[PDB]
Design a protein around this ligand. Structure first.
Ligand SMILES: [Ca+2]
Ligand SMILES: [Ca+2]
Ligand SMILES: [Ca+2]
Ligand SMILES: [Ca+2]
Lengths: 316, 145
């Protein structure tokens, strides 16, 4: 890593977000004028793992970001290091989440949904060809490079949980958002590239219905539904969903890792790449449920109106 | 409230900042307050801005807006500010927010939303199903989530 000061080469600006022990801020390279995102990860380097990140995890994330070069995946530009943090200067992705963009649409067929899902699948395919598991695939990490074009460009971000799958070595751990993890994660079973496919299935379920397959009222219910593979296609949420989409999700949400679809098999599934004009027309006529999806969007619109009105009242 | 503060930030700041320069002058706050029936004076707007003006530039920056939101949420009872917000929404004082009142408030705020979006807002807020928003439905829209 570069031991030089970040502020010597980059103008640091607004805060774009944060995580557990990392904070991302918009920045601009002084020598070029181009804009990037500086992710500051607080170094730990002490046995007490309560506050900070180990150097092993930081080096693993940086190595993964260096090995990855795809138009659907974020690209690492540079890395600096001072006495407290390690700063990853990454490609700026300023189009918000994919779901936040899809929600503000008027109508969404399954064809455009499959186009976005196929961008995601191309990213995951580039990652899996190099035997690199993402292990943190969720709508929060599906960003847009710009919401300024008709069909925006998808980027996969946050490689804090990415890990290299080596042949013949066992890698077990417990991480990620419970709503989107595979049964082998909750059961502390050997992990592989199949958990990414399970999370892609959950993401497709949520995109298609606005509901989550295994999400319960508590974490215990969620884990029990994941380990028991307990989900359904309720007609209240899946009235308009096609049969190909349900078959795709069903083939992605399987417990046994060897029977779960690989990324290439999902790329060749008829719902993503139709075989004949009949199923293509069926995927055209099928409409996604945009009501249960825009639920939270209109709720936050309500809350925004409330906040404006309350701030206006509080000052007079 | 990382998620809620980020959402309210991105939305409320952009709704106030109708020219998009990164700051909020007294004129924008004045226009928003005048579209809501309030009539504050220039001195009052400057006093509002100065109580949070940390860098002393005359306008409200982003973290100053955040701290103003924090001081708003801290210096008042939740139920009372929710009641005042409802009284602002409900103009005729009948006790129910109809579609017309909600649309009027949203357009006064500066929102260019069609009738379908107002209908879906009313429906998402409507629990009993009468087509209007009770005070209880309002507070449950604003309650814990
Ligand atoms: Ca302005
Ligand atoms: Ca200021
Ligand atoms: Ca009324
Ligand atoms: Ca009602």
């Amino acid at each position: 890593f570069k031991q030089q000061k970040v502020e010597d080469f980059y103008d640091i600006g607004e805060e774009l977000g944060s995580g557990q022990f990392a904070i991302v801020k918009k920045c601009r390279e002084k020598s070029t004028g181009l804009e990037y995102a500086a992710k500051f990860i607080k170094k730990r380097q002490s046995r007490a793992s309560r506050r900070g990140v180990s150097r092993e995890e930081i080096e693993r994330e940086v190595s993964i970001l260096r090995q990855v070069l795809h138009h659907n995946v974020i690209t690492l530009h540079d890395v600096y290091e001072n006495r407290t943090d390690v700063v990853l200067i990454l490609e700026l992705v300023s189009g918000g989440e994919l779901f936040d963009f899809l929600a503000q649409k008027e109508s969404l067929s399954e064809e455009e949904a499959t186009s976005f899902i196929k961008q995601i699948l191309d990213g995951v395919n580039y990652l899996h060809t190099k035997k690199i598991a993402h292990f943190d695939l969720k709508p929060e990490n599906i960003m847009l490079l710009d919401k300024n074009i008709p069909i925006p460009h998808i980027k996969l971000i946050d490689f804090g949980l990415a890990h290299e799958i080596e042949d013949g070595v066992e890698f077990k751990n417990i991480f990620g958002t419970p709503e989107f993890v595979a049964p082998e994660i909750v059961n502390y079973e050997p992990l592989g590239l199949e958990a990414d496919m399970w999370s892609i299935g959950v993401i497709t379920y949520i995109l298609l219905s606005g509901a989550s397959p295994f999400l319960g009222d508590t974490k215990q219910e969620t884990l029990a539904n994941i380990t028991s593979v307990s989900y359904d296609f309720d007609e209240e949420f899946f009235s308009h969903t096609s049969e190909l989409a349900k078959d795709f999700i069903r083939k992605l949400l399987v417990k046994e890792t060897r029977k779960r679809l690989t990324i290439q098999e999902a790329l060749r599934h008829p719902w993503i790449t139709p075989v004949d004009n009949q199923q293509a027309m069926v995927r055209r006529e099928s409409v996604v449920n945009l009501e249960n999806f825009r639920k939270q969007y209109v709720r936050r619109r309500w809350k925004l109106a409330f906040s404006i009105v309350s701030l206006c009242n509080h000052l007079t | 409230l990382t998620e809620e503060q980020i959402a309210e930030f991105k939305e409320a700041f952009s709704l106030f900042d109708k020219d998009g320069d990164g700051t909020i002058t007294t004129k924008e706050l004045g226009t928003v307050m005048r579209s809501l029936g309030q009539n504050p004076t220039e001195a009052e707007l400057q006093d509002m801005i100065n109580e949070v003006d940390a860098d002393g530039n005359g306008t409200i920056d982003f973290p100053e807006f955040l701290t103003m939101m924090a001081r708003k949420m801290k210096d008042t009872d939740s139920e009372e500010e929710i009641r005042e917000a409802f009284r602002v929404f409900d103009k005729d004082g009948n006790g129910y927010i109809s579609a017309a009142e909600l649309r009027h408030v949203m357009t006064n705020l500066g929102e260019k939303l069609t009738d379908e979006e107002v209908d879906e807002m009313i429906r998402e807020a409507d629990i009993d199903g009468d087509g209007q928003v009770n005070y209880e439905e309002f507070v449950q829209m604003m309650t814990a989530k």
